[PDB]
Amino acid sequence: DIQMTQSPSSLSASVGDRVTITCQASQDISNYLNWYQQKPGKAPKLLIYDASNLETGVPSRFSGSGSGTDFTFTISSLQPEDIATYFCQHFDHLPLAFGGGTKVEIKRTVAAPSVFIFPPSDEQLKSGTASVVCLLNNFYPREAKVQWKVDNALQSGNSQESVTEQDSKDSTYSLSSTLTLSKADYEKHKVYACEVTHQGLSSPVTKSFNRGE
Amino acid sequence: QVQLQESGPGLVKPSETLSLTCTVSGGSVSSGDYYWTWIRQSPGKGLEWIGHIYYSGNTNYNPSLKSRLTISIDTSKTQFSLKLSSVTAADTAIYYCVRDRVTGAFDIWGQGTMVTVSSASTKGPSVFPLAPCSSTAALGCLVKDYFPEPVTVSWNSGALTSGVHTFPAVLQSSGLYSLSSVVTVPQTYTCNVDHKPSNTKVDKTVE
Amino acid sequence: KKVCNGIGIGEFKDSLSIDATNIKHFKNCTSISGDLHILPVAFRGDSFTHTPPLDPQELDILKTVKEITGFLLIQAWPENRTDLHAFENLEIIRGRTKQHGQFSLAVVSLDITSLGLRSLKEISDGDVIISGNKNLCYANTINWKKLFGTSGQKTKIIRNRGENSCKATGQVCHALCSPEGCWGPEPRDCVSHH
């Protein structure tokens, strides 16, 4: 079967920059190629059909070129809402297949996160388990370090993180860290702190609360 | 114009049959200009073309799924369905129903439905508030311990969208999923949690 | 000799396709004045007007047709017949009228193993699309530039049988064939030779 290989697998560029991604077919597929855009949490959207034709309703900054084996997809002026994974797809002969996809993200100015810590609810405490959540809101770059401290004791191995996809407006990220403790262990200690380390912070920021207070 | 939407169970036990139905609205399925297509997406397999069916009855299947594949049309109700038997964990994916124009493009897609192949049982979520311990403030909900994916979260029945962050779910060491949704706020705030695999709807008011 | 109309004109007015009832009007016909439509009604039947499926041996009526002024649109073919030998002596498709104003020849989702258009020598205007034929071979061999009469006529051989799949069953052009392609395995199926 025809193998569709895209290059690069991921990239980041500034707003207004010219972005070019490659799709390479293992066989000559004439112009039987389509380009799709998949924004976070959405189904793929057709942008370019027959290698070179712009689908109606698609902004004019998107274009495609190529025939045979090598094809190129181009964004003339990268915009923040273009954060997506871009796929190429052939329909030369059976079966049809997609490329691996190219992830496109925005490079913007450094933005420091807003930190919030949430104590576990009394509703959950009755169930025998306690979850402590830390929120890192609207920051760039994506790299961030969250450190849990329970009475100055560094916590490790009992927390999970989750990070949103890049925002389609301000190009920021958001991160949530959940510290999971048993009810009995949660009652033993008083101070619960969330220390975050980020490039946009001159020194690490700590948000904390006292249990019961 | 024309819209497609998927329907079917989000949890299928292993070695059983996966059944999905796509309902075409704003148009008919009895046109010679379109291939009624099924496409799935998963990590490790990426976007994968499952197959299609023409209104003449002719079908084309991906040979990787052919032995277990069946696609049919019901022009009466303007629908076409998908049947995948003897499923394993390798069939867990997001399944789209797609209109493939004969010219050569997947020009109309459905929103997509999550299908998880697992012998585990369905469990509804517990929703806990996220409130500070007594200038931008933040509040939210914690959708804890559910299976399988997904869970839909909205605030004030969709009226509140500005400043909302619903994080991707994480898989805990218990095999259950958990996520949280937050809102930043400078008035009642209610998160609307929906877990269709367990028919669980929750309206949690946070204060 | 004499000519007959296409689907939607003349004896086939207010009709959508060639069914088992209007095929009798193609007897002793040598030229089609318009487009003919071969839709899935022709072989699955019609429950509304009680039209039984057109017999696969009855398609030989169209063997006398060699000229089509409009477009040839095929979306159904008998599972018994492995080629389009019903149009074995078809020689020219003018394509004055085109499907959606674009296509003059369309072969969509058939089980045929070959096209078998041994006599086709010219397609004056319109694009050629051949999609969804899992068993079709000899398609990518045809040099369609020899048939086109207008610059810009495209060929869409898409969603069809693989190149190696036809080469695995020995369903390629004969050794005596010219590099321009063929409509089948036989030495007579060649479009040209030396």
Residue numbers in the entry:
A (entry chain K): 1 to 213
B (entry chain J): 1 to 134, 140 to 191, 198 to 218
C (entry chain M): 310 to 501, 1502 to 1503
Published text:
The epidermal growth factor receptor (EGFR) regulates critical cellular processes such as proliferation, differentiation, and apoptosis, and is a major target of monoclonal antibodies in the oncology setting. The two FDA approved antibody therapies that target the ectodomain of EGFR are the mouse/human chimeric IgG1 cetuximab and the fully human IgG2 antibody panitumumab. We determined the crystal structure of the panitumumab Fab in complex with EGFRD3 ND2 and EGFRD3 ND2(S468R). The binding site of panitumumab partially overlaps the EGF binding site and prevents the EGFR ectodomain from forming a dimerization-competent conformation.
An established mutation in the EGFR ectodomain S492R (S468R in the mature protein sequence and the numbering used here to be consistent with previous published structures) imparts resistance to cetuximab, yet strikingly remains responsive to panitumumab. Panitumumab bound EGFRD3 ND2 with a KD value of 0.34 ± 0.03 nM, while it bound the S468R mutant with a 3-fold less potent KD of 1.15 ± 0.07 nM. However, cetuximab showed no measureable binding to the S468R mutant supportive of the finding that the S468R mutation exhibits clinical resistance to cetuximab. In the EGFRD3 ND2(S468R) Fab complex, the guanidinium group of Arg468 sits approximately where the water was positioned in the EGFRD3 ND2 Fab complex. The Nɛ of Arg468 mimics the water interaction by forming a hydrogen bond to the OD2 of Asp100. The pocket has an overall negative charge that may tolerate hydrophobic or positively charged mutations more easily. Tyr104 would sterically block the binding of Arg468 in the S468R mutant. The presence and position of Tyr104 explains the large difference in binding between panitumumab and cetuximab to this mutation.
